[PDB]
Amino acid sequence: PKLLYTSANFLGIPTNRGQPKIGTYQGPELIRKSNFFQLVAEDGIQLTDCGDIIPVELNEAEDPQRFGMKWSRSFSLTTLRIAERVEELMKQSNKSTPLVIVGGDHSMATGTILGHAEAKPDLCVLWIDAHGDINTPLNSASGNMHGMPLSFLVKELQDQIPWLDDFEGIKPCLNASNIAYIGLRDLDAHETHDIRKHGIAYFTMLDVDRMGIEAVIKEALLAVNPRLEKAIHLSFDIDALDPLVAPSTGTAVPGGLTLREGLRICEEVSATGKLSVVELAELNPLLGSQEDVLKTQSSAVHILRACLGHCRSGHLPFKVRNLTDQGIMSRAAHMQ
Amino acid sequence: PKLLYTSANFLGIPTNRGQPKIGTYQGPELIRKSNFFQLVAEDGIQLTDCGDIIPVELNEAEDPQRFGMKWSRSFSLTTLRIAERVEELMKQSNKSTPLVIVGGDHSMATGTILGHAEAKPDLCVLWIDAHGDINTPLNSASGNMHGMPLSFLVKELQDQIPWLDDFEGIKPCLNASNIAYIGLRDLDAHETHDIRKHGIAYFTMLDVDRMGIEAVIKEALLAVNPRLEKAIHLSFDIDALDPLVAPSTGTAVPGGLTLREGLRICEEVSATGKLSVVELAELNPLLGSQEDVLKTQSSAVHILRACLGHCRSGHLPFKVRNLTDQGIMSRAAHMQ
Amino acid sequence: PKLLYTSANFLGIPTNRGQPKIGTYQGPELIRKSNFFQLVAEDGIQLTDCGDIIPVELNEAEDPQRFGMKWSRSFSLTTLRIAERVEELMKQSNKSTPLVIVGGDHSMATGTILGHAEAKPDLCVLWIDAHGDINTPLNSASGNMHGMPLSFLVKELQDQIPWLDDFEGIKPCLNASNIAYIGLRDLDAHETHDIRKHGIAYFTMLDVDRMGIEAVIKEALLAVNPRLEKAIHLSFDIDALDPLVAPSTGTAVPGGLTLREGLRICEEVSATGKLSVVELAELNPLLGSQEDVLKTQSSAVHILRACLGHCRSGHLPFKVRNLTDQGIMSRAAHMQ
Numbered sequence A, B, C: 001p002k003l004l005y006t007s008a009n010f011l012g013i014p015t016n017r018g019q020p021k022i023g024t025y026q027g028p029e030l031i032r033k034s035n036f037f038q039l040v041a042e043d044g045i046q047l048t049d050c051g052d053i054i055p056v057e058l059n060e061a062e063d064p065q066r067f068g069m070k071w072s073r074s075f076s077l078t079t080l081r082i083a084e085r086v087e088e089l090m091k092q093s094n095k096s097t098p099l100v101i102v103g104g105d106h107s108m109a110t111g112t113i114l115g116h117a118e119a120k121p122d123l124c125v126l127w128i129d130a131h132g133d134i135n136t137p138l139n140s141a142s143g144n145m146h147g148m149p150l151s152f153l154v155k156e157l158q159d160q161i162p163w164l165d166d167f168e169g170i171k172p173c174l175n176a177s178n179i180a181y182i183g184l185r186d187l188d189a190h191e192t193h194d195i196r197k198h199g200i201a202y203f204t205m206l207d208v209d210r211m212g213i214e215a216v217i218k219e220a221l222l223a224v225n226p227r228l229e230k231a232i233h234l235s236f237d238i239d240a241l242d243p244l245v246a247p248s249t250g251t252a253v254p255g256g257l258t259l260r261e262g263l264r265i266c267e268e269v270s271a272t273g274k275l276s277v278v279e280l281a282e283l284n285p286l287l288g289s290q291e292d293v294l295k296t297q298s299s300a301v302h303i304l305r306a307c308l309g310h311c312r313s314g315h316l317p318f319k320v321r322n323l324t325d326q327g328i329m330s331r332a333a334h335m336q
């Protein structure tokens, strides 16, 4: 059989300074420890583990609050380290070779999209999330960076981003028109304001309920990738899925996507042939029971396999086995 | 932004004599103890806690079985106390001001609808429930009052209600044509008989499966509130939701509404502008594990927020924050 | 009211040599121990417990591996014992009288279909399962018989079945065109190859997602039972349902049918009037927590009740109770 993607790269980013619950740094390990790699090879894909990006984690004294942001210099230093590594991987990829990134809290997305856009400036972004993650710093109630990662990247938002020297190299590489959200159900007011003002395509769980996921996917792809010309950066927050199916995550919100709805998003996005980067964020194996962690891990693996082209309707074998070749008598043969 | 309802009243009714499992009396506390009030205020709604109705709970000697009914004089005395309090609240409400009632087992509905109809005689009732709760007393296998509350209220059923002096003030204020059921999946035979005989609109989980919830809501509202002329009494039994999402309740039945389907019912009913009373019944925080109770509580809060107009697609902020007003340099400003 | 089936037979088959996890032999007991029998009688169906089939379980020395198969002589001996008993029951059934079989691992299906086809050679098979269970022996990675049961039965597969004397009486009684799958999401490559090559109708969770269960059922029935002329053998693997709703089973796969989707399959299949045999496979009450076992048991009972005609929209009573006959004064009567 033929594959859309025959090889793929894998990268861990154990960010944990974007939100205060310890454990998202164990995200990549949660996936490495799974049968993910084995299942992908069983499908005929050559998957290369490119290791982990080491985040910059400064101490309290070196990284005081600034404009309410917690760990903002850790954030900016990490953003640039991430961007550099992703850019480098995406350029040696130039059948494309998708990069699979396992986080880590969602604050990594500023860095991953930054680097990705360097290699492929024309990209679009599909943001699968219960949350907007597009708070500008003075509007954030939490001061957690994992709630702001897109705001630094969107050109139309720059008049609401306070200036900092160490953020200078974080160049806004996205237009509002290049992003589509699926799964929203917990926007902060100011996000709603920005999303509506600048016309960012979004499809909330309400849209998913009224339209159905099949149409929502079609609409999202239509909105930001009409003729499949652009590379896709698929940013998948695990908390988009329902807590019944992904409990081990920092900010669970009831009424989420079913696993199946999530698989459909990924299957469709994979099948475009334009999946350039997929990142899975906000796994925290330190949250919930042991069985919660397994449910979450399992959901992540199915989700990630779908992204690489796994087909729930089955895969043909590489060589068809035949009974005679082993010198073995078949029942049909025997009946003579 | 504008709201359909800018204020709202909140009332607890800790009924527990309608069914034998202790704990539904802790229902209202389960919700007060939650972030419900905070979330509602965050949406710009002024919510007034009107306290709890104290139920009449007689002892065994004072309240023997009568026609098989358990605690029927506690029921009738409580029905009148409830009716009086609700009538009083709904008249000082005369942008309507919705009343949110947290139970308590479902037997409270005889009282709440009675009083509600006093203030607004022309109402319709949307009954969201896995059960009919319309057993007449000699047909009830359990003798539990929470399985009979509508039978006393429906005019066409009065020839099957045995007469009791203390029930005289429970005047049948509903026509069969004023009620619509959504969510049914466990009707007793005699309920099925009555529901079909007198032509009560009903939509079972089977209808929900074949029609989809969007159409079922439209049909229900069409059946009992064609042009949105009537006040709506929305009686929401928590056990309508699936046990996976509301386990802490006395008579759980598998195959229920998803949380999302429930939210859609409430969102639609809210958006009519006719939500006059909403009541949530059969929470029992004494049932199930600690995590079961949290799941149930959480579902109740999302459900109740939807009823008051909460929007999963987001809310605009009351004042838009701007970076310059604080004397702060934006990144866009800096780039000159 | 009228019933499609007024009586029914019940048979346990505690197979456990088709897969290595101990406990599927407790399947039938799990259902007998439930309120299943009571609920069915409450619907007006006369259900006769025909006891259990005793499987042949040979020791290691007597049953070595052959062509990789584990316990293949236990399998063949059991297949014939099952076939004989089912044939006998289905002939004394000649309003049909459905046979309800509770397993037991799925390897029993070779025997049950064999015997069923003896009594009703013209049957079709609806296979509800996350798995294909149609591996030929040299293609099986596990060597577990519960993954092969259909391969011995399908005429087009016989050139890939190795001959064994003790399998001679296992006569291939099915054509590829007589089988339809619903629920697939974990086919082995060689199954996919066979299913596509010989044109077996199949509807995976992907089809269920895109088409919706209502259409998938219609298509399946169209594919193998166009004008409802054929008896239906409904082979229901509990692991077709989602692990959230049937956790206690040996090979759980995420992203399954909802309980409701499963009920719809059964309701539709029941309503054809052609439900001849229904079998439920792969219950293992030795797996999972106590609450997992209850969830699974409960799902099985609802599923099996649906198969026998249970209606979620309610059942009429056998005799309508009337208030006057007991010499009792109604409220309506009193108001004169």
Ligand SMILES: N=C(NO)NCC[C@H](N)C(=O)O
Pocket (backbone or CB within 6 Å): A106, A129, A130, A131, A132, A133, A135, A140, A141, A142, A143, A144, A146, A147, A148, A188, A237, A239, A250, A251, A282
């Ligand atoms: N887990 C997430 N987003 O994906 N949290 C964001 C929460 C909130 N919007 C904030 O700024 O903190």
Ligand SMILES: N=C(NO)NCC[C@H](N)C(=O)O
Pocket (backbone or CB within 6 Å): B106, B129, B130, B131, B132, B133, B135, B140, B141, B142, B143, B144, B146, B147, B148, B188, B237, B239, B250, B251, B282
């Ligand atoms: N929880 C409920 N209804 O909402 N129980 C009612 C059970 C049954 N119909 C009865 O009369 O007791």
Ligand SMILES: N=C(NO)NCC[C@H](N)C(=O)O
Pocket (backbone or CB within 6 Å): C106, C129, C130, C131, C132, C133, C135, C140, C141, C142, C143, C144, C146, C147, C148, C188, C237, C239, C250, C251, C282
């Ligand atoms: N539980 C099941 N099928 O229903 N297991 C089959 C697993 C696999 N296809 C095999 O041959 O072992």
Ligand SMILES: [Mn+2]
Pocket (backbone or CB within 6 Å): A106, A129, A131, A133, A146, A237, A281, A282
């Ligand atoms: Mn996020």
Ligand SMILES: [Mn+2]
Pocket (backbone or CB within 6 Å): A129, A130, A131, A237, A239, A240, A251, A282
């Ligand atoms: Mn999120």
Ligand SMILES: [Mn+2]
Pocket (backbone or CB within 6 Å): B106, B129, B131, B133, B146, B237, B281, B282
């Ligand atoms: Mn109720």
Ligand SMILES: [Mn+2]
Pocket (backbone or CB within 6 Å): B129, B130, B131, B237, B239, B240, B251, B282
């Ligand atoms: Mn109920």
Ligand SMILES: [Mn+2]
Pocket (backbone or CB within 6 Å): C106, C129, C131, C133, C146, C237, C281, C282
């Ligand atoms: Mn099976």
Ligand SMILES: [Mn+2]
Pocket (backbone or CB within 6 Å): C129, C130, C131, C237, C239, C240, C251, C282
């Ligand atoms: Mn299976």
